[PDB]
Amino acid sequence: RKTQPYDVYDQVEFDVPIGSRGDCYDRYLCRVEEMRQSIRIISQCLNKMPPGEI
Amino acid sequence: VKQDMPPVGGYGPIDYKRNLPRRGLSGYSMFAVGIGALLFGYWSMMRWNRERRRLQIEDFEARIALMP
């Protein structure tokens, strides 16, 4: 998403979480913060919706 | 006229904080409460034990004087 924008993802502000020790509790916390950043992308998407076309 | 669904007037903030209030107190207070209540129970148990020791000696007097 951050490297190759396949859509307008380059114009929403978030940060993908990184792991630390390559580990299942650590991977769990990575999933949790990916959920949190999905909430932030929903917030910015509801902020900047254009009334363009279907 | 147009009747799409844009955000009408903009939507407010949405929280994403890890908001953990950390309910409770320090652990030294927890040790103080535990040792205090434990020692309270020890003193009350000691007093009741020696009261029943007095009554147990009285029951021994009953069995001594009752025997011949």
Best of B2, B3, B8, B16 to disrupt the A interface (most A CBs within 10 Å) is B16
**Rounded-to-integer distance, Cα B65 and Cα B62, Å:** 5
Sign of the CA dihedral with B31 first, then B33, B39, and B45 last: negative
Tell me whether A44 touches chain B (CB under 8 Å): no
User: Is there a contact between A49 and B6 (Cβ–Cβ < 8 Å)?
Assistant: yes
What Rg value do the Cα atoms of chain B yield, rounded? 35
Experimental technique used to determine this entry: cryo-EM
Residue with tokens 């908001």: B19
Element (DSSP H or E) covering residue A25: helix A24-47
Say if CB A16 and CB A1 are below 8 A apart.
yes
